[PDB]
Amino acid sequence: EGREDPQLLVRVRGGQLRGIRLKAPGGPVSAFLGIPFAEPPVGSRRFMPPEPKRPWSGVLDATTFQNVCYQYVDTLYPGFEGTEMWNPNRELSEDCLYLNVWTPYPRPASPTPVLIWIYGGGFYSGAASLDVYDGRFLAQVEGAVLVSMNYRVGTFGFLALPGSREAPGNVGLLDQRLALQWVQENIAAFGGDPMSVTLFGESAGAASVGMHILSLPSRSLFHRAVLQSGTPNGPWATVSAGEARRRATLLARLVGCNDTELIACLRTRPAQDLVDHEWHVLPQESIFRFSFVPVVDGDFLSDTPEALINTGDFQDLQVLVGVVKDEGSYFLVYGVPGFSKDNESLISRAQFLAGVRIGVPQASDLAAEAVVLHYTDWLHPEDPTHLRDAMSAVVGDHNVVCPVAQLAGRLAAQGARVYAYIFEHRASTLTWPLWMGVPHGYEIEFIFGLPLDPSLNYTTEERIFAQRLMKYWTNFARTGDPNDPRDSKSPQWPPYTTAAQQYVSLNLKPLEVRRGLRAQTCAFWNRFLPKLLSA
What are the catalytic residues? Predict the structure, then answer.
């Protein structure tokens, strides 16, 4: 050193880092990008739990985002912003275990509450370097320390031969835990308070957060949690050991392959060969199902998430959970016949019946009959607009809204302080059609405060709204309470309770309190539907 910025040189347990001074709209922030937290999970290390990064010599350059974990790249709508924003924005590589830190400039003297972001992407995609996960605004406006990590997705992160030494499963979840441990040891070097760590994530990110709650060794690593449109419970976020074993063995066959000899062969295959056959191992034609997800191993997860939340002690737990207005709409264009971004997707009754089989791929004929019965409007059973919207509701309720209601109730009844929301504002900038409403993942840009960037063409009300949400989230991280103790007449956000079931709406209007999270409909999915599976 000698001639460089004093605020950009930090030491962590593994060596020295040089960061970068970035511009946020209201002033500068410090960013430390692509910090390695694990040994590169390559060669013989593929499918294995991550090993902590061995110390380095000299000053590591941390001024750019690192590799994105090897993954499927989406091709459904070539050129289209609505899909491309989720695509990898850095080189794909198995050498991808790096994390990022944003702090105020200059760094705070008094220790500051830490927010850790875990991205979604169905456990097959995602990256902490996407524009919608830009930590600069929360760092600058709210004085937060913000951390995000890459974790292995797809086969690399989740292929499992349960029981074996060489592919135990859930290793993507372990990548996340390693980063949480890295925050505990090192975040005070950046002015962060390791005793005030909040996890937040959206859709497999949310489900990820939920699994850290349910897994004891992760519980000591954080204090509060946010789950946006995602739960560890529900139909897509985990598979049984048997089901994981089956998908893993099948995928091996597809690429040319005693567990040891199997995995050893898999390790000789190029990454791209595994991505190429990833989608061919699902049991049924489906949407909102992903090939390689967390497995119930009797380790990371001691029992099913359903079981762990029924019988769990959550006395010391503060949790914020919610959903977007249209949870189901996004995935309909990925393989329900009739749906497209390019038209209004008015469908027939036949397409709806077919849609229900694809969207609830585990239903018997009788259970699918029940779904269809409940979601048909019997005044207008053949109306294309209702059928289109009902198909969206079926997917959203089954996969997100009802799992979230189930989780909120079981947490509240067992000690937890729970706050609940529904996000209802469709961004002025959205590129998806109007019929998709507010699709999942389109709250994220507001929480991270992108509208504060004048170059992005958000409206002024959207700028004020973004600030409102950043406040809710950072208040919650600080205190376990989204409300401001100061401002006391602007309507309060009540905790969600089994008794009253209150949650708030999030839009341009001030907070409105509501009761019952799709209560009638969720009784159908969460209480009745399991009984119908036992016939």
Answer: 203, 327, 440
